[PDB]
Amino acid sequence: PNFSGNWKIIRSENFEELLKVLGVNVMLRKIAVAAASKPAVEIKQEGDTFYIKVSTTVWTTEINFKVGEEFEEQTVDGRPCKSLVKWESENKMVCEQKLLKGEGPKTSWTKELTNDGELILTMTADDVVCTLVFVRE
């Protein structure tokens, strides 16, 4: 469907647990968690080509990809990764991430627009799954 739109969060899960697995210490986790509790997402979709803007009060991230086409972004703790997105349904894409330099936990994300209009993205580090639920602003 149309992932395109401006999205605001309504529900979050396992986000502090995600930063724990990535090795962010406790005081930092709590602070970052609260200060990134209301991230703003903007998506412009053009077929299989995607633009995503994720933004907190002082930070913003820009992501651009074509489905099927290898590109470079960063992990959640800021590490360089080669990324590949593929479709898993009409509503859902999956991205596998490969660290450009070095080793660490297995990272991936998914993006799913439900039929009832929720944008669900999940973020994964090893066996930990962070879920963020958004609706259109």
Ligand X SMILES: *C/C=C(C)/C=C/C=C(C)/C=C/C1=C(C)CCCC1(C)C
Which tokens sit at 27?
């005081």
Q: Is 47 left (phi over 0), alpha (psi -120 to 50) or beta?
A: left
H or E segment to which residue 134 belongs? strand 128-136
Tokens 């991936």, residue located: 108
CB nearer ligand X, residue 32 or residue 102: 32
Shortest Cβ distance from residue 32 to ligand X (Å)? 6
Q: Supply the minimum distance, in Å, between the C-beta of residue 109 and ligand X.
A: 6
CA distances from 73 to 6, 12, 129 (A): 21, 23, 19
CB of 73 to ligand X, least distance (A): 8
Closer to ligand X by Cβ: residue 71 or 102: 71
CB of 15 or CB of 103, closer to ligand X: 15
Return the closest-CA partner of residue 45 out of 94, 86, 5: 5
Contacts with ligand X, residue ranges (CB under 6 A): 36, 39, 52, 54, 56, 59, 61, 63, 76, 109, 111, 121
Q: Which one, 102 or 109, has the nearer CB to ligand X? A: 109
Least distance CB 33 / ligand X (angstroms) = 8
Match 């991430």 to its residue by tokens: 97
